[PDB]
Design an enzyme around this catalytic site. Sequence first.
Site, PDB file in Angstrom:
ATOM      1  N   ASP A  12       0.837  -1.204   0.000  1.00 48.78           N
ATOM      2  CA  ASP A  12       0.000   0.000   0.000  1.00 48.78           C
ATOM      3  C   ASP A  12       0.873   1.257   0.000  1.00 48.78           C
ATOM      4  OD1 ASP A  12      -2.333   1.541  -0.092  1.00 48.78           O
ATOM      5  OD2 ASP A  12      -2.807   1.296   2.032  1.00 48.78           O
ATOM      6  N   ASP A 152      -0.974  -9.576  -5.835  1.00 49.82           N
ATOM      7  CA  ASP A 152      -2.275  -8.936  -5.652  1.00 49.82           C
ATOM      8  C   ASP A 152      -3.007  -9.010  -6.985  1.00 49.82           C
ATOM      9  OD1 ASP A 152      -4.504  -7.453  -5.225  1.00 49.82           O
ATOM     10  OD2 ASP A 152      -3.434  -5.619  -4.597  1.00 49.82           O
TER      11      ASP A 152
HETATM   12 MG   LIG Z   1      -3.049   0.978  -2.119  1.00 51.37          MG
END
Ligand SMILES: [Mg+2]
Length: 243
Positions: A12, A152
């Site tokens: 992130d 991801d």
């Molecule tokens: Mg992110």
Amino acid sequence: SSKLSIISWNVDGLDTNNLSDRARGLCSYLALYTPDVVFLQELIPAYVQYLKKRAVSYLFFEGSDDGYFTGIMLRKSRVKFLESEIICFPTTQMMRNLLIAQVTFSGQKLYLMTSHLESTRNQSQERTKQLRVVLQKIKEAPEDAIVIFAGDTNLRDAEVANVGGLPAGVCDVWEQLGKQEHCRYTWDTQANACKLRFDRIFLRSAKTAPPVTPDHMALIGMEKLDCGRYTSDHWGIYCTFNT
Ligand SMILES: [Mg+2]
């Protein structure tokens, strides 16, 4: 231990709030487990620079040097590096691609792959096209190699069904281990009501060795840091393989 261990995690990096504290958190998890391979997504340059200063027992490979990108870390005492490459996703709108490292692990060749498949619900079409590229590359990998993809995937609904499912000899590790509920959802807006299994591991054996089976899988990073935030809006995956 003949078992191969990996961690896969979207860090992130596009959220700059408390990024330094969260990068410290990530590093502490990596040190605690000391995995043989780390698959990372959504790194930014300042983030990977921080990891390289602290993890000098690992070789680093990055999917780009600009924007945000993936990375692979290899534990040098355990994994011998052979070569690496990047496969481009020609119609990505978000600089996504496929990062690949070829290594040997106790004499056994491994192809290690990671991607951050196209984000957002309405890019379902492009994400599906990218998944097809990934699955083709897994299927086409030299047959003397074990293939491990971790990343991801941003997958939801029946997007995997839309590509035709997984190719012969390729499994989803979470499914293979019994679709256990405790390590199912890797992105959870309630605990971090929307819960999704974005982060996935795909596995293919080598023709020249007995089938590789997953041994154990668990989610990590579920403890808030001193700053009051989690390391990432994703949970990380820890996984071992009977090699
Ligand atoms: Mg992110």
